[PDB]
């Protein structure tokens, strides 16, 4: 038998990381990212890029307690629309290791695994996505001591060590006279979360 008292969950990394948490936007670890309606944006799904980036409570701070991780990414995007007309967002999945186009066009993004999200007027619309572990590495490292390329130009990075890149293109049926920018918010969760080589927790006040 057990008896048992079956040790409550919440202690298990498979359960703890299944819940959604606000992803810090690349750069300063900002809670939101603003991009124009003309070109769109490309948001990398790379841990190292998320932990630029020593935060405090940010999900990044929790992931920085492990050296290597391997899980199936769950991502929820929010597109805040400022103007008074409805729009449509084209979200395409570039696999980790794929060539990212310089000018994202509707035709080229259609060759990847894409989704066409209707966005409502004067409000934000939410949509959830599921991506399996597609990285060519055995485990995605959060920290890396070395160079990405043999020439040694990029230090402490592995572009392929990620779930890939998400390419966004806004679409409008009406023509606006003033160019406006969308606001983007991201949530991330993990399925079948596996972690290797623990690291010390980040400091606090």
């Amino acid at each position: 038998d057990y008896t048992g008292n079956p040790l409550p969950p919440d202690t298990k990394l498979e359960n703890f990381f299944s819940f959604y948490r606000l992803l810090p936007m690349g750069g300063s670890g900002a809670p939101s990212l603003s991009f124009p309606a003309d070109e769109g944006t490309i948001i990398p799904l790379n841990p190292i890029n998320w932990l630029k980036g020593a935060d405090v409570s940010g999900i990044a701070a929790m992931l920085s307690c492990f050296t290597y991780i391997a899980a199936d990414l769950r991502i929820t995007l929010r597109f805040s629309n400022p103007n008074d007309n409805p729009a449509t967002m084209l979200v395409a999945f570039a696999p980790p290791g794929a060539t990212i186009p310089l000018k994202p066009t509707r035709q080229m993004l259609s060759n990847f695994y894409m989704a066409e999200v209707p966005v409502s007027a004067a409000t934000s619309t939410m949509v959830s996505f599921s991506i399996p572990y597609t990285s060519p590495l055995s485990a995605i490292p959060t920290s890396y001591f070395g160079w990405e390329d043999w020439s040694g130009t990029n230090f402490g990075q592995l572009s392929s060590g990620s779930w890939g890149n998400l390419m966004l293109i806004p679409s409008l049926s009406v023509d606006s006279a003033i160019p406006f920018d969308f606001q983007l918010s991201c949530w991330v969760a993990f399925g079948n979360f596996k972690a290797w080589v623990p690291r010390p927790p980040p400091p606090l006040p």
Partner: protein
């Protein structure tokens, strides 16, 4: 319960992934044939056990001295070539460096000698790592990046010979330090093995939570030496030569040296390094670090 989320569970055949309803997609384990490597200590690499038709065909330290982690299980390798092993000439205990430990050093002071490197994570490493500006600094060195420090210390060893001749390597590491003090001496050093040393990781190793990393304490109250060993780690089954340091050694001070009066204000330390179970794949021309 089974929390309110869905970790997997998974599906198949048309259960958790049909044209009527969906749950989160999950990746399966890739069952590959090949030579058994990756995990050091347990190498024993041997043979393993096109599939489509063509259109044109018909508590803790300094208690004992054991491995910081237990050795893991081997995995099938992607490359078909047979490895080259240095054997006892390579896998041996080498005198890595001799360094001084003075009482002026305070809590969390990383100690390193001539063969060591100044690495707090903030130093701009000029490629390749063999550049002299990386090892010679205005201040005292702090770390011993493996195998970079080991290969630099002994560039003529059989281990370094294959290291400069093969694109990838695979081995564990064992570090030992001997510090002899009389019964009247007091103080404690910590032997840290830091995986993928970066700016934040090295500074947290100096702090209170650093004991999450592999560690053994060299307390002068009882010990004169302390040993620590770690198995192989990396994002790939074999590490690229000259471009990746999986482990880095840190000998820092927990309790500042407290020598008896009228005696020297510093004790000498001897740092040893031991590569454990070494294999090298992909033989080609000589490209040093």
């Amino acid at each position: 319960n089974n929390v309110t989320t869905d970790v997997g569970a998974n599906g198949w055949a048309p259960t958790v992934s049909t044209g009527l309803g969906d749950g989160p997609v999950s990746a399966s384990a890739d069952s590959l044939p090949g030579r058994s490597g990756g995990a050091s200590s347990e190498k024993t690499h041997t043979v393993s056990g096109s599939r489509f038709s063509k259109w044109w065909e018909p508590t803790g330290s300094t208690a004992p001295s054991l491995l910081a982690y237990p050795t893991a299980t081997p995995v099938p390798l992607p490359n078909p070539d047979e490895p080259s092993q240095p054997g006892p000439s390579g896998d041996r205990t080498w005198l890595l460096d001799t360094v001084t430990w003075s009482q002026e050093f305070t809590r969390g002071w990383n100690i390193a000698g001539s063969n060591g490197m100044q690495w707090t994570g903030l130093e701009s490493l000029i490629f390749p790592v063999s550049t002299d500006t990386n090892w010679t600094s205005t201040s005292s060195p702090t770390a011993y990046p493996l195998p970079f420090s080991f290969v630099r210390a002994y560039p003529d060893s059989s281990w370094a010979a294959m290291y400069n001749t093969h694109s990838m390597w695979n081995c564990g590491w064992r570090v030992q330090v001997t510090v002899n003090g009389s019964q009247f001496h007091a103080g404690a050093l910590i032997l840290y093995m830091v995986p993928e040393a970066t700016t934040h990781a090295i500074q947290t190793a100096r702090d209170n939570a650093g004991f999450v990393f592999p560690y053994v304490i060299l307390n002068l109250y009882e010990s004169n030496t302390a040993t620590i060993e770690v198995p192989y780690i990396s994002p790939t089954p074999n590490t690229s030569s000259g471009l990746h340091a999986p482990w880095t050694f840190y000998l820092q001070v927990l309790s500042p040296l407290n020598p008896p009066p009228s005696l020297p204000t510093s004790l000498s330390c001897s740092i040893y390094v031991t590569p454990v179970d070494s294999s090298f794949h992909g033989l080609r021309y000589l490209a040093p670090q």
